[PDB]
Write a protein that binds this ligand. Structure first.
Ligand SMILES: N[C@H](CCc1ccccc1)P(=O)(O)C[C@@H](Cc1ccccc1)C(=O)O
Ligand SMILES: N[C@H](CCc1ccccc1)P(=O)(O)C[C@@H](Cc1ccccc1)C(=O)O
Ligand SMILES: N[C@H](CCc1ccccc1)P(=O)(O)C[C@@H](Cc1ccccc1)C(=O)O
Ligand SMILES: [Zn+2]
Ligand SMILES: [Zn+2]
Ligand SMILES: [Zn+2]
Ligand SMILES: [Zn+2]
Ligand SMILES: [Zn+2]
Ligand SMILES: [Zn+2]
Lengths: 518, 518, 106, 510, 53
């Protein structure tokens, strides 16, 4: 509970914004075939030209206004093209002689938009909402989208539009105002309508994870993070338990505790539970890596490209899991019991830190020789995994910013998934597809197992030879799940949006889809 | 006996030590080959060379008291095999008593005087014969010429290499039994019989050092290390004194204390004493470098090839000294007084650590400018040497994993010896020859002395210019021995067996031969 | 049983070698993937033959990598043999493809 | 041979000054007991205090009323004896003659080291450089070995000699006052020879690689041989190919300069009782090859010095050719080439065949020395000599093992090693015996070739390189002197000409 | 002043067994009667600099 402080100006909680301007947006969805009233604020058509690359903009929707209609006559729009991401703004007077702003975002030639295209599309739309004080946006859909994509559209629109100012003080945006109303025209209205509030929940889960990740390590430490989880659990009516050092010791979580030894913040193990009202048909343990700061320990992140300044993000996995708890706690799925777990600690350099070479004992009795204190994640997860399996769940899915190697394998767009069970991996895949958080299945190659053979301990933490460290890390983790379907999502490469200089909150939607569709 | 401080209750508070090794259960028997070879249960190995003829055929010279085995090992049957160094074969036959026997041979090359290291290759080949094969008995037949030392050496090496440290094994113990009988057939057996128990002592001394070295730095720390020394002293009836920080401060050991400042473990200075029953004719101080973990301090071991993960081994000198204490305490030499010394501490990074640039004062009043916190060994040794010489000894020999340069100079096989005294150096060199722990005499080049001229302090810890750091470290050390014959053995290169991934326990035999042949 | 004792099932048309392969002598060795032992001995013909095993672990399905480990162990015996023929007896379960891999790797 | 040229301004040879100012100096030696004359020039006393850095006190009787006052104890008490500390003053002598008088601090050390004596000779040299003098007179108020006395001389000459060849005065008389000046006279001209051999090596080393390339270097050796009446043979690529020197030729492949193998021979007049082959590493520039010297601290700019070994050997040829020892036949050898990056260079991974038929896998093109030496050693042994000594700036590791002061000696023969050590003692070029550790041999076991050039594992590269070289001497006493650490004087930014005296002493005493 | 002063606060065994400063500094300069004011300023400046040092 009580966050330790070195100086009274050290902050004692993570600032969190629950009531975002996004949440205040009154959303309306309409059937396209009833026609668009273009009345105020800004009214953007999403338009594609199926086939011809860089085609004309032709506005299909019947528009209930002679003047907007004349404006948008194919003739008038022909000069503008649809190159995905192009946008144009139009200013005119409608029927009641009321100046309206209109425009379109180019949606490309390909009539089925990829997740990445939909993103580039929202981004164009958000640059239209920035630097333009608007009370109302209206998006007319003149493209084919499935229900998940329109949900994604909204999730991304909400999340990209949002602008984290928690840490701003003298350099807040003096000229920032949010829309109060969002109008959406689409075909099949009724069907897409259900995606709206789902999107809003998904948005917040993601954004909430985002907020935790973005919170710097002085704000977001093991104590303040676990406090925030307790606060979230209380707001969602989730069962929660925070395991403190004494309990951790009793549970013999030596790998986890060893990582935290060097920190001024006592380890805190987060255990949230959501139980369905009905019969419980599926028990799931979601495990997030919760390193609130990763200095590397005595294996200090000193090497070029080690990005020590980014390491506040090493609790992204935990964030993903918490954001998911938000979503599941809000959407209240049936027939599931979900455990949200994170072995939270901070990996620091101290007289008290664990050293390279240390042999430590995991809660399952396996002794581990520490080859590198910067491979701390898998040590914390090891004990979290033993814990998860002791819960007697059907699935254990962990999500962790585990390996920098992910940048070299999948890059910044697709997370890696490893696991010991094909059905479970496929479930993650499907959840990847429906959440639009891209995940790729990577192999746990058993041949590498032998390089974890320690001369003194039961197991090495790291390989000496094998540079395929995401695989090796997975091999290591696999040793801590005895008999349960388990999957591991390495979001090290994807978690942080380097270009936008912010977290993605990656994994919240994925895990939620996973929980919801199982 | 002091409390091992702990961070968490899962932190171990002692080094686990195996005193009663399976090797102590081996009943060993030497028989003269004149008498002939009883070939029965177990495995009966011949050590055979073919003088001059490189990879020549195997010939069994010795009498075998069995028509059947004899017939089997008759020349016509043995020329399908060659004596190439370290090669081996397994034979299977039914003996004179209708009993099935396992006989074999290890090829001893073609040079009838195996060097220390060939013999190491020969043992290794024979160990592999003992591994994966539950034998109650090994019978070895020397059909090669070795001398007392070399014969011992084989026993000592065999014992050592056979033993398998499972102390840090939990779920990954090997399911591994040990021969309970060693039979040796050699010419002039009676002259060799005396080597057996000496080898067994030497083995354990070495193995004991090995145990300490291998113990990771969370297990083996200054408090637990000194506790183990106390325990060893108590078992051997040695006088002991452990100097704690208050006494160290009183003694003004600022160089030593500065190193430890950053550690959570208080410095502990180990002082063990063996005094002979008779008139004391020689007083020897053995000083071992006792850095239980060397992180490098603020000069963190972050550079490629700095091998931070190995740095539990930086107390090897202390280990060698302690193992030597075991041998001396056990073999009880006469007319000698031996002091076993190690200034034990841990070189860590902390708000309390000493910094590069700090000027610190040794117990002899010399002020030292710290140019690199990673050159900590010489600092601790400085104060240890001043202490040693205050004891009024005839010789001071320090042994220390002092400089990584040793890898560049002598490599992994031969330790470097430097000293201020030729007679003493020659004694170490003779001891090298008789212990078969290879050492090479390296110069203390006075020309380099000037690069230790600090602008502010009396002396620089490190050279700025001279890259010959083993020699520079030696020059630095020399400054702390005013008037006593002193040698320094740099075992940095040699202490860890990188290929086998284990300590060698290097120096125990060397130091014990040194002590004993005086 | 990981690192399980060796037990030869095949009947062999030799008395000496059958004796050598009995369960009592063979239980002294283990099946740790890649572990081998092998002895020279005289067969019912006073002919000089070598006999052993290569441990194939405790999994009834060998991977390619696992097979490579087995072959590598064989190939070791081979590089120190001035023998005339190799006989490999599969006391493990292998499909057509793995078997070709075994040969190609050997 | 015509050195090839990229441009009309590419030097086609190495400037060499043979007639150094140091030759026009007349050297005289007076028993100090007789007293000291102060007539002209500067007079330096070599004084020590056997009190650490204690007061100065001049011992010798001195033939000048007015200067003896300057030398009075209470005047000198103002000055100290700390190693290499000096002061000197101008004044007027007995005959109003502008004489300078001073001292050098010889520390408290009773017996001067090779090092401490350089510090004396350096302090003294400063004053020579800052002072326009006719004569310099040195007074020995300390103890010196005939060898240390000779060392004093050559160190003086050499440090005093300033190489001005690459730019766009000196005393004409040297006085020595020494206790027992009869024993020492013979050291003078020996010192002078030794000086020049060293200085000549120095000159070659210092010459940049555009000046000193394989063609110009061999040309210079030929010129030296001609001046000394030595037999000489330069092997060109056609002969090297016929001799199957593929290790050596591989290294040179990338160079615009054809390999040149220098073979000089001095044969004694009398019965030849000892045949010696001296082999010097002669890489005129070492870029590293495709293993380019790009790493921090690889000092690519220094790599003109990678023919130091060759220079040492040529300098020694000068001394031997000049001093004309008896009962020895000496072969001076260097497989000279340049290690360059080119479409024609050998690559890492190449397997090449030495002249003895051993195939070598090239693990690193920057470990080229041993490749050239291999072929040179096979050549040397074919000569049927009693000893082969190679000297080479072979391994940077030497800086980490012995540093900049002592060269490393490895060998396959104790007697020969001891001879080198004895030569080290008498030449005052410090050498230390390092082991060839056979345990490391196995890391030269190539999977494909007969042998690997480098270890993969072992970082003890001086030892590994020695193991590799050993492979190319079948049956002859052989020693290898690694002067990589010691060859260049980094502080003075010049070569030391290391090895010339060592090798000459070796030849002369054995 | 600054370059003449040796800092020995951190020696103890190192000497300095020779180092002893002049007691007198004489200067001879043109219109010295002006330069004279610079002397004590220099001494203050020296010590400020030396103190920082
Ligand atoms: N949270 C770290 C990886 C995340 C990351 C993301 C982007 C760029 C760089 C790093 P880590 O726990 O230090 C994991 C180590 C794994 C490791 C560390 C040290 C030795 C072996 C493996 C790594 O992948 O670098
Ligand atoms: N206990 C360390 C060396 C032991 C060792 C053994 C094998 C490989 C690497 C290192 P050290 O005290 O840091 C010795 C320092 C010496 C040193 C001297 C001056 C500056 C920095 C380091 C070093 O070798 O790194
Ligand atoms: N002409 C080089 C040594 C000269 C030298 C002297 C002092 C400092 C740096 C370099 P080398 O042939 O590249 C010898 C290599 C040895 C070597 C061996 C194997 C791989 C790479 C380099 C080296 O020590 O750098
Ligand atoms: Zn890490
Ligand atoms: Zn991490
Ligand atoms: Zn260190
Ligand atoms: Zn150390
Ligand atoms: Zn090179
Ligand atoms: Zn070179």
């Amino acid at each position: 509970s009580e966050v330790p402080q070195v100086v009274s100006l050290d902050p004692t909680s993570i600032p969190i914004e629950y009531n975002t301007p996004i949440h205040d947006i009154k959303v309306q969805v309409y059937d396209i075939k009833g026609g668009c009233n273009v009345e105020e604020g800004l009214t953007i058509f999403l338009v594609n030209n199926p086939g011809k690359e860089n085609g004309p903009v032709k506005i299909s929707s019947k528009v209930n206004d002679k003047q907007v209609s004349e404006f948008l006559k194919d003739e008038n729009m022909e000069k503008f093209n649809v190159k995905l991401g192009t946008s144009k703004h139009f200013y005119m007077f409608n029927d009641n002689k009321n100046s309206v702003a209109v425009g379109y975002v180019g949606c490309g030639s390909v009539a089925d938009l990829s997740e990445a295209d939909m993103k580039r599309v929202v981004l164009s739309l958000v640059t239209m909402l920035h630097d333009n004080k608007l009370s109302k946006l209206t998006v007319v859909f003149e493209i084919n989208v499935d229900k998940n994509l329109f949900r994604f559209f909204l999730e991304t629109l909400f999340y990209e539009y949002m602008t984290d100012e928690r840490f701003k003080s003298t350099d807040k945006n003096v000229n920032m105002e949010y829309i109060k109303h969002l109008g959406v025209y689409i075909n099949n209205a009724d069907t897409y309508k259900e995606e709206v509030e789902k999107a809003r929940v998904y948005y917040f889960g993601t954004y909430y994870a985002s907020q935790l990740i973005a919170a710097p390590s002085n704000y977001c430490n093991p104590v303040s993070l676990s406090n925030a989880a307790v606060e979230l659990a209380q707001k969602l009516n989730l069962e929660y338990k925070i395991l403190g050092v004494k309990e951790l010791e009793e549970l013999k979580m030596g790998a986890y505790l060893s990582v935290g030894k060097g920190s001024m913040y006592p380890n805190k193990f987060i255990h949230l539970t959501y139980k369905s009202k009905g019969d419980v048909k599926k028990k799931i343990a979601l495990v997030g890596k919760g390193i609130t700061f990763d200095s590397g320990g005595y294996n200090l992140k000193a090497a070029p490209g080690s990005m020590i300044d980014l390491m506040k993000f090493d609790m992204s996995g935990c964030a993903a899991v918490l954001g998911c708890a938000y979503c599941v706690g809000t959407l209240k799925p049936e027939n599931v019991e979900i455990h949200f777990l994170s072995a939270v600690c901070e990996n620091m350099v101290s007289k008290n830190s664990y050293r390279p070479g240390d042999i430590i004992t995991a809660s399952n009795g396996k002794t581990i020789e520490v080859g590198n204190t910067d491979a701390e994640g898998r040590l914390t997860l090891a004990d979290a995994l033993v814990y998860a399996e002791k819960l007697g769940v059907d699935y254990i899915v962990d999500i962790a910013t585990l390996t920098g190697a992910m940048l070299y394998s999948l890059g910044t767009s697709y997370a890696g998934v490893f696991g010991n069970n094909e059905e479970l991996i496929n479930k993650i895949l499907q959840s990847s597809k429906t959440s639009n958080e891209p995940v790729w299945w990577l192999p746990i190659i058993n041949e590498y197992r032998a390089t974890l053979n320690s001369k003194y301990a039961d197991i090495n933490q790291i390989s000496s030879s094998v540079k395929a460290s995401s695989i090796v890390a997975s091999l290591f983790l696999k040793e801590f799940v005895q008999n349960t379907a388990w999957a591991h999502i390495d979001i090290a490469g994807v978690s942080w949006n380097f270009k936008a200089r912010k977290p993605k909150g990656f994994g919240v939607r994925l895990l939620t889809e996973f929980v919801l569709n199982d």
